[PDB]
Amino acid sequence: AHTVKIYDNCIGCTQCVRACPLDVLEMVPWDGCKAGQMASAPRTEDCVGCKRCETACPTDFLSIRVYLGGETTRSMGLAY
Amino acid sequence: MPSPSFLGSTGGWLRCAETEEKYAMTWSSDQQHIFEMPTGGAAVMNSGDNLLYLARKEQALALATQLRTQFKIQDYKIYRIFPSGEVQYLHPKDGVLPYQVNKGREQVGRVKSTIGKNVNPAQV
Amino acid sequence: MNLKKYLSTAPVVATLWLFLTAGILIELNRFFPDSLFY
Amino acid sequence: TEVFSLEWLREAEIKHCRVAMLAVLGVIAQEFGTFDFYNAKSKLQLSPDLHNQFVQNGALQQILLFVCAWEFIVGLPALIESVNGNREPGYFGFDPLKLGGTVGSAQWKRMQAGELRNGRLAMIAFGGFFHQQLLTKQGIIEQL
Amino acid sequence: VKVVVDRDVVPTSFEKWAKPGHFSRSLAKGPKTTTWIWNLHADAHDFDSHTSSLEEVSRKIFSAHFGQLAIIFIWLSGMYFHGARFSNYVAWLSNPTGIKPSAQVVWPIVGQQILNADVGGGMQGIQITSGLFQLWRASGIVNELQLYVTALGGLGMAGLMIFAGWFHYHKAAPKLEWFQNVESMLNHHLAGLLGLGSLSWAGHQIHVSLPINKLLDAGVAPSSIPLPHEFILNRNLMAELYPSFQQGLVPFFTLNWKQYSDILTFKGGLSPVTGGLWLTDVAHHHLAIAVLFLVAGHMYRTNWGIGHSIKQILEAHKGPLTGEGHKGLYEILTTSWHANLAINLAMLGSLSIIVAHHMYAMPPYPYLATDYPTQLSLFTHHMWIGGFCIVGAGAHAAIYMVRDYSPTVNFNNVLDRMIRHRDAIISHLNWVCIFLGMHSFGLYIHNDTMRALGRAQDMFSDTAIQLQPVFAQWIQQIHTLAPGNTAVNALATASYAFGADTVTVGSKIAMMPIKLGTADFMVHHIHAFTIHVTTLILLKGVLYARNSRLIPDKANLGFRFPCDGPGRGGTCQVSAWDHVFLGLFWMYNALSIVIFHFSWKMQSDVWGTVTSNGAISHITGGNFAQSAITINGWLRDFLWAQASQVIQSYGSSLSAYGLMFLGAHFVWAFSLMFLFSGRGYWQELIESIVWAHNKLKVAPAIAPRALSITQGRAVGVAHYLLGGIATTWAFFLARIIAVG
Amino acid sequence: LTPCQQSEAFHKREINEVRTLENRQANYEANSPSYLALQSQIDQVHKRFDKYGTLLCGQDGLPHLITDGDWRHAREFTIPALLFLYITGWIGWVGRSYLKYTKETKNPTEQEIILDVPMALKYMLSGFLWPLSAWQEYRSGQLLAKEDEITVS
Ligand SMILES: CC1=C(C/C=C(\C)CCC[C@H](C)CCC[C@H](C)CCCC(C)C)C(=O)c2ccccc2C1=O
Ligand code: SF4
Ligand code: SF4
């Protein structure tokens, strides 16, 4: 489906999973940040790509990118 | 398991829901209450855990987000596959995703510049 | 005091100056024609 | 009930009660020699309808409305604060105010002595004085 | 019921006016963006987006009520002034036919004096279509002095309301308890406003009718008209003009009501002298409405214990398909200021349309039916007013599920069901819309095909006899035989549009038995199509505003939001306010087709002239007996022949209605800039201009940004409507003046 | 294309326009005061045609003109109706620019764009001789900018 790629601009303020609808991203301990959190998206098969994390993403250029890819039932958000 | 009663049809008896994977949530519900479904009107919440059927994943997570704002209750959502495969996709760590956990890993993570360079040096 | 601050707002100043510019032109087309001399 | 609104209300009462008295003492003064004497031939030439739309008095009223503007543009800020404008009449009045308070024990609030009664009497009397003489041609019923 | 007042809550100070955006701390600390400039005005009237204290929201809307009320009074006080300083109402009072209406003059500045239409009566100006002269003649106003006294009396009432909306607020303030008295509110709106209002005006047109009826209809000069007080000061004058006034409220107590039959009648139809309804039937009408409202204004609990109440009335209505029906609706309307506004906008919006229909059907004012420009203008005027109002009803009935609906507090299982089987309501309306579209407009495609194809339209004539004069024909025949039979006390029909072959003419045709035919079944179903689609999209915005299948967490985003993003294939324009934005557009199409239908069909078969050598010759003689069935006739004989009255007017005084006609297409196509492009490209467009602004540092501190995604669509519909009304506003005011 | 004082096809339009206006003029009584102003309006009409005749005007009666720079027609373009637009517009523009220079300082930038002290608006009259002084200050604008612009990346 969609391709989630995390920039190196992360501050770890958990804005992803707070905004994110179906919890695509996930906070993971990391050793190269101020707060110490990093966003990671294992369940990219279930990602829909609604692009609501780029709104809550603080950085000048956003830190969580999701490039538009293929479309499946998991990424169309349809109930049928 | 005792589940809230809802009238109005719409949600049930859909062929697509039967042939497609379905979602099953639950909540503690220590007290009798009254809530609203993300796709229905109003319904009374009974004591103990309550199992429902959901056809979308966003429908399965918005209800948990709405429950967390009411009272403080741990949520459990289980995501079933087409045949009969039942896997715990929600809270596989059992730790809340925004909060920090010990079980850490990285999936699909490129550590390059910000303007672009879409090639990934290593997938794992 | 504060009435002058409300008088100093963007819409009030804009309408006041535009009233001046419009009235000058209404009086211009009513009074002398442009003489224009080669 | 509020402060700043009742301020302009009581002020407008004072700002017109003196106007509603100098006009009465002006309209009566100009007609003191022609009140009666055969009812001044129904006000004679003083009838407003008989005037020539104020040809000669219009350019004079414009000058009056101009000077009266800045007169009240002095009354608007002189009321603001006590100092300068109102403070000098302040201690002037305080010279009769001290004697008046001595006659009236602790303070004798002058506003109860006659600030509201004069203010409202002038307004009501001038409102009726402008209708009986300027707002009735055919009486139909006798006016008593 | 208790006098609970919170005297002095907000002080009178210019401090808030000094701060641009004092109503919201979010719109005050950060005015660094151009978008903030538009947000300051977009949320300026969204009072529920500031503070949540209902005691203050009720003390911010009743203020806006008195403010808007003062604006309306300032507006009305000028109408009596314009019909006295520069107008022709007195000359028109003496000569009503030859003197065209006018109450607006221009000045010699840039040669614009060509707009001074030669109307007559020794005064030139701009023709008016507001019905002011008909209303003033029906009010007994003759002299110019009676205009100025009413205007100077309007200034007083206009000032008192400003000093009232500034009284119950900066000076006084009732508590929150004063607003849950909805029971005490309907007892004063249906009896104090509707009741005493229908009685006060009733008592007027009984003593002011004879200066119009038994005088101006006889043939007396306006100078020979006696004074209205001379009729009251001498009861015998009223007694001679009406031989029932000699009694003077004596059989009123004796219940000998028949002795008041000289002013109180139920004739029906129109009067063959004035040109409108009877001047005696309306007086009896308002008397009948007044007593009915004096009875209907006593229905709810005051502070004596008797009567019903909106509470238990709705707590008692049940129903099998409703379940816990009607209960909780009291808590629905008594808690949300919004909630009352949709049912008000809905009822009052349909009311403006219904009263617009009642205007042309039975003309209530004298010399109104012959005044074709005024009649045509007033109908479509209230028509579009109600269109906006009903869409506002949808705009706020969508607000309710988002802003004030809870799954614990306010509860009606009826509204619950409207949201529980919500997918069924719109499914029904959807199939109804499609059936009424693929046929009503399908038959348009069909007939337009039959003509260009050849002999198919010839064989369609038998079907043209079908549908038309098949239905609704018997309804008119019922109304023909309704007087005498089912109306023994009525010597005329409801209107002469019902009485067959009965034509009333006063040198110009007033009303006609509107013989349906050819394509009235066509346009009425084009209407029903554009009505069901409008109701569908607005009701969709109503009940889908809370629970949506696509996005479950809908209540978090809001009402006037853009969308969610490119996910799920594409979530775009899913807000209920957008169902209103597009609901404004289908209402636009509905009202556009209805005003087209009414306007043109009138001069097609109703409006015309009369000669003695013949009978009836219309302005456009019976054209839409064929030119209405196909789409081509709607721009071959309708939209085409109208350019000869809007453009061929530069040599006359109707040149402004051509400039506005051609200039309204400009602003309409200017709406095609916002309704098609996107903020992304335009935001990339500013930063280049901002680069030029950073080259000379002429960049403003307020950072240049594009319009909001929602504000662009709000301005887009604003121009699509303004540019989509001013054209027909210039068109309805084009031909009707040339063919008047 | 001949001038209209010699173009016989232009004076005919004056006669024809007054002829169309005369039918509207004669239906009302000239002795009435509300229509005595029509004679003053046609006086304005008459006083308008004579000045345009001096300008070269179309033979058709549609009065054309010159923008090539011909010194005989500088009145229709170059000198009056053109240069004043440039000066008056830029007297506003460079005055706005001077206000943009004083748009910073301590008091908030938003306060100094919108809620400005009226005194700056009263100082606007400063720009009597913009040209070269404005050129100096615009040089300084480009200079102190030091090519500080947006990324465009
Ligand atoms: C033009 C355009 C813009 C930009 C719109 C802008 C910049 C609005 C400009 C309006 C203002 C009022 C013009 C600037 C005038 C200043 C206020 C100065 C006025 C000072 C005096 C004249 C009073 C969008 O943001 C947009 C968004 C989505 C789809 C299409 C579009 C679109 O087409
Ligand atoms: S959006 Fe970016 S900066 Fe914010 S918490 Fe997620 S990874 Fe960190
Ligand atoms: S791509 Fe969409 S669903 Fe996935 S994390 Fe980002 S906002 Fe959430």
- Per the structure, how many domains does chain E have? 1
Print the domain residue range for E459. 1-740
Kindly give, in sequence order, each residue whose CB lies less than 8 Å from that of residue E604, ignoring residues fewer than 6 positions away. E618, E620, E622, E623, E624, E625, E628
User: Is E389 within any annotated ligand binding site?
Assistant: no
Compute chain B's Rg from CA coordinates.
Answer: 18
Q: Residue E47 maps to which CATH number? A: 1.20.1130.10
Helix (H, G, I), strand (E, B) or coil at E214: coil
Dihedrals phi, psi of B24, to nearest 5 degrees: -130, 120
Buried b (16+ CB within 10 A) or exposed e, E538-570: bbbbbbbbbbbbbbbbbbebebbbbbbbbbbee
Residue labelled with tokens 């209209």: F4
Q: For residues F13 and F62, give the distance between their C-alpha atoms in angstroms, rounded to a whole number.
A: 9
Ligand 2 near A24 CB (within 6 A): no
The residue contributing the CA closest to ligand 3 atom 1 is A49
Residue closest to E105 by CA, chosen among F35, F21, F20: F35
Kindly give, in sequence order, each residue whose CB lies less than 8 Å from that of residue A78, ignoring residues fewer than 6 positions away. B56, E568
The single-letter DSSP state of residue E497 is T
Q: For residues D47 and D136, give the distance between their C-alpha atoms in angstroms, rounded to a whole number.
A: 12
Residue closest to E586 by CA, chosen among E635, E627, E550, E541: E541
Facing residue for E421 by CB, picked from B9, B34, B66: B9
Nearest CA in chain E to F19: E651
| Contact pairs from chain C to chain F, CB under 8 Å | 24
Q: What sign has the CA pseudo-torsion D15, D20, D21, D26?
A: positive
Q: For residues E87 and E85, give the distance between their C-alpha atoms in angstroms, rounded to a whole number.
A: 6
Q: For residues E116 and E128, give the distance between their C-alpha atoms in angstroms, rounded to a whole number.
A: 12
Residue closest to E637 by CA, chosen among E628, E645, E646, E648: E628
Compute chain E's Rg from CA coordinates.
Answer: 29
CA distances from E345 to B6, E385, E505, F16 (A): 33, 10, 38, 55
Tokens of E132: 């002011």
The answer to whether residues B80 and B57 touch, using CB atoms and an 8 Å cutoff, is no
Q: Which amino acid is at F14?
A: E
Task: Point out the ligand 3 atom lying closest to the alpha carbon of residue A52.
Answer: 7
Helix (H, G, I), strand (E, B) or coil at E511: strand
Helix (H, G, I), strand (E, B) or coil at E703: strand
CATH architecture of F1-153: Orthogonal Bundle (1.10)
| Backbone φ/ψ region at E366: left (φ over 0), alpha (ψ -120 to 50), beta | beta
Q: For residues D141 and E8, give the distance between their C-alpha atoms in angstroms, rounded to a whole number.
A: 47
Chain C residues touching residue F117 (CB < 8 angstroms): 8
Q: Residue A29 maps to which CATH number? A: 3.30.70.20
Ligand 2 near A75 CB (within 6 A): no
| Interface residue E11 vs chain C (CB under 8 A) | no
Q: How was this structure determined?
A: X-ray
Q: Looking at chain E, which subunits does it touch, using at least 3 CB pairs closer than 8 Å as the criterion?
A: A, B, C, D, F
The residue contributing the CA closest to ligand 1 atom 31 is E674
Residue closest to E654 by CA, chosen among E88, E117, E109: E117
The answer to whether residues E364 and E275 touch, using CB atoms and an 8 Å cutoff, is no
E351 sits in which H/E element: helix E337-361
Residue closest to E685 by CA, chosen among E706, E700, E664: E706
| Interface residue C31 vs chain E (CB under 8 A) | no
Residue B98: is it exposed, middle or buried by C-beta count within 10 angstroms (0-12/13-18/19+)? middle
The answer to whether residues F103 and F113 touch, using CB atoms and an 8 Å cutoff, is yes
DSSP secondary structure of E11-65: ---THHHHSTTTT-GGGTS---BHHHHHHHHHSSS-GGGT---HHHHHHHHHHHH
Chain D residues touching residue E171 (CB < 8 angstroms): 1-2, 5
CA angle B102, B108, B114 (to 5 degrees): 105
Q: For residues B11 and A76, give the distance between their C-alpha atoms in angstroms, rounded to a whole number.
A: 19
The answer to whether residues E7 and D5 touch, using CB atoms and an 8 Å cutoff, is no
CA of A64 to the centre of ligand 2 (A): 6
Q: Do E702 and F113 touch (CB under 8 A)?
A: yes
Tokens of F4: 């209209």
Q: What share of chain F is helix, strand, coil (3-state, %, to 5)?
A: 65, 0, 35
The answer to whether residues E493 and E269 touch, using CB atoms and an 8 Å cutoff, is yes
E635 sits in which H/E element: helix E633-636
The answer to whether residues E739 and E641 touch, using CB atoms and an 8 Å cutoff, is no
The answer to whether residues E259 and E248 touch, using CB atoms and an 8 Å cutoff, is no
| Contact pairs from chain A to chain B, CB under 8 Å | 82
Q: What sign has the CA pseudo-torsion D30, D36, D41, D47?
A: positive
Chain B residues touching residue A48 (CB < 8 angstroms): 57-58
The answer to whether residues E664 and E684 touch, using CB atoms and an 8 Å cutoff, is no
β-partners of residue B54 are B23
DSSP secondary structure of A41-55: -S-GGG------HHH
- Per the structure, how many domains does chain A have? 1
Q: What is the dihedral of CA E447, E449, E452, E457, to 10 degrees?
A: -40
The single-letter DSSP state of residue A65 is E
Nearest CA in chain A to B61: A22
Q: For residues E430 and A17, give the distance between their C-alpha atoms in angstroms, rounded to a whole number.
A: 38
Q: Do D5 and E170 touch (CB under 8 A)?
A: yes
Q: Do B111 and A8 touch (CB under 8 A)?
A: yes
Facing residue for A40 by CB, picked from B61, B100, B105: B105
User: To the nearest whole angstrom, how far is the Cα of E23 from the nearest Cα of chain C?
Assistant: 15
Buried b (16+ CB within 10 A) or exposed e, E153-176: ebeeebeebbebbbbbbbbbbbee
Strand E504-505 with B42-45, pairing: unpaired
Q: Do E17 and C6 touch (CB under 8 A)?
A: yes
| Interface residue D1 vs chain E (CB under 8 A) | yes
The single-letter DSSP state of residue C32 is P
Residue E603: is it exposed, middle or buried by C-beta count within 10 angstroms (0-12/13-18/19+)? buried
Crossing angle (nearest 10°) for helices E520-543 and E440-453: 140
Kindly give, in sequence order, each residue whose CB lies less than 8 Å from that of residue E410, ignoring residues fewer than 6 positions away. E328, E331, E332, E335, E404
Q: Do B39 and E552 touch (CB under 8 A)?
A: yes
Long-range contacts of D77-81 (CB under 8 A, 24+ apart): D79/D11
The residue contributing the CA closest to ligand 2 atom 1 is A57
Kindly give, in sequence order, each residue whose CB lies less than 8 Å from that of residue E294, ignoring residues fewer than 6 positions away. E191, E195, E199
Q: For residues E421 and D112, give the distance between their C-alpha atoms in angstroms, rounded to a whole number.
A: 72
- The per-type count for chain A, helices as H runs and strands as E runs, is 3, 4
Nearest CA in chain E to C28: E109
Q: For residues E382 and E369, give the distance between their C-alpha atoms in angstroms, rounded to a whole number.
A: 17
Tokens of F34: 């509300």
Residue closest to F3 by CA, chosen among F69, F70, F49: F49
Q: For residues E393 and E340, give the distance between their C-alpha atoms in angstroms, rounded to a whole number.
A: 10
Residue in E682, E687, E693, E705 to alter for ligand 1 test, most ligand atoms within 8 A of Cβ: E682
